[PDB]
Amino acid sequence: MRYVLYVPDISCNHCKMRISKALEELGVKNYEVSVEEKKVVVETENLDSVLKKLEEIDYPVESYQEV
């Protein structure tokens, strides 16, 4: 299923990568990051694993929502 995280730590361009590296190594297969809108979609079967990974890269998510 796919979820639009809200990651305000992506206020910067370097921050965009921090997520992606950790998502690729998490093993997501469909995702997008936005520094413009401080946002991440992931498409995965355990969202928890993503939200965990986000906190464990120092990037606490505010909220998410399914799309």
From TrEMBL:
GO molecular-function terms, A-Z: metal ion binding
UniProt keyword terms in alphabetical order: Metal-binding
Signal peptide: none
Domain HMA: start-end pairs: 1-62
The UniProt record lists the keyword Metal-binding: yes
One matching Pfam family: HMA
Protein name stated in the entry: Heavy metal binding protein
Organism: Thermotoga maritima (strain ATCC 43589 / DSM 3109 / JCM 10099 / NBRC 100826 / MSB8)
